[PDB]
Amino acid sequence: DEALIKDYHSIREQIDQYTKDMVLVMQHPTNCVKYINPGRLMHVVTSDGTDFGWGVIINFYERRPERNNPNPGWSPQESYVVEVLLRLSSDSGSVDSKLKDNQCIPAGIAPVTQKNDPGRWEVVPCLLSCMHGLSQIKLHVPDKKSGGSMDDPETRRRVGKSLLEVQRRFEDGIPHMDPIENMHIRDVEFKKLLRKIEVLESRLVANPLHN
Amino acid sequence: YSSPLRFFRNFRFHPEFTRLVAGGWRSLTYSSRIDPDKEMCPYELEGTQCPSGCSFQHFVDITPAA
Ligand SMILES: [Zn+2]
């Protein structure tokens, strides 16, 4: 039962690596820039695994290197910043709009964790490397064919509350854009990636230590 | 364990799909009728009435076909 724990974790580690590869492809600007649209929902999960849940995309921009550091060595997934309306814990500090050279998300903020906490909706700069899902759903955000703007705390509260309501109405989960059928990622190696994950999962769930 | 593929469209063909997803083939999560470029109606999400002729996407538009 100890060589058998080895096979179990070897399967989980193959799945983990292929998942990281699949995620990189979906985060690549060539594949996702067309879908980073104001109002579309994005699932933000940071480099360290902190899950911010679903937010609303507000704006999108090419990250600019510093003065100091003309070639910082950013991956393509690190070369673009998505401003996302997220729900922060009430004790999160003020949000620094400007991400430094080595940051994927501002410092000093976190998702709601305590069950009492109602949270606070703020626009948070996030790198494309924090995108762990895009929804087919878009919510209405203030462009100026309307008025209002997410500088207004009450607009942020209202949009966030409609994000909570859309989640309530999707009993089984916010719908994800399928990388093949909605994002039209046609790559032959990408289809192979998904198939290999499926085959390994079949092996994982057939292992008796899986429960 | 949660599969990274669980929210993609091919999960509908997994033999455990109906046992794992409460709504099954009727689930809105796996609906093929969502227009990704139309915003969902904010009046509907807010509990207010749509204006006459409201052209946002509504929940009745996206309820599955099978
Ligand atoms: Zn309406």
Author numbering:
A (entry chain A): 654 to 864
B (entry chain B): 1017 to 1082
What does the paper say about this structure?
We therefore decided to explore different strategies, including generating a single-chain construct in which ctRed1pep is fused to the C-terminus of ctMtr4SA via a short linker (ctMtr4SA–ctRed1pep construct). The single-chain ctMtr4SA–ctRed1pep complex was readily crystallized and the crystals diffracted to 1.99 Å resolution. The structure was determined de novo using the anomalous signal of the bound Zn2+ (Zn-SAD), whose identity was confirmed by X-ray fluorescence (XRF) emission spectrum analysis. The asymmetric unit (ASU) contains two molecules of the single-chain complex, which exhibit very small differences as indicated by the low root-mean-square deviation (RMSD) of 1.02 Å for Cα atoms of 269 residues. The ctMtr4 short arch superimposed well with the scMtr4 structure, revealing that the ctRed1 peptide is positioned on top of the KOW domain. The N-terminal region (residues 1017–1024) of the peptide contains several highly conserved residues, among them Tyr1017 and Ser1019, which form hydrogen bonds with Glu854 from the stalk. Furthermore, Pro1020, Leu1021, and Phe1024 of ctRed1pep pack against Ile668, Met675, Met679, Leu847, and Ile850 of the stalk helices. These interactions are followed by a U-shaped structure (residues 1025–1046), which is positioned between the stalk-interacting and the KOW-interacting residues of the peptide. Residues 1047–1080 exclusively interact with the KOW domain, including more hydrophobic interactions mediated by Ile1050, Met1056, Leu1061, Phe1075, and Ile1078, which pack against Ile790, Leu792, Val819, Phe823, and Pro828. The middle part of the peptide (residues 1047–1056) is stabilized and held in position by the conserved Zn-finger of ctRed1, composed of Cys1057, Cys1066, Cys1070, and His1074 (inset).
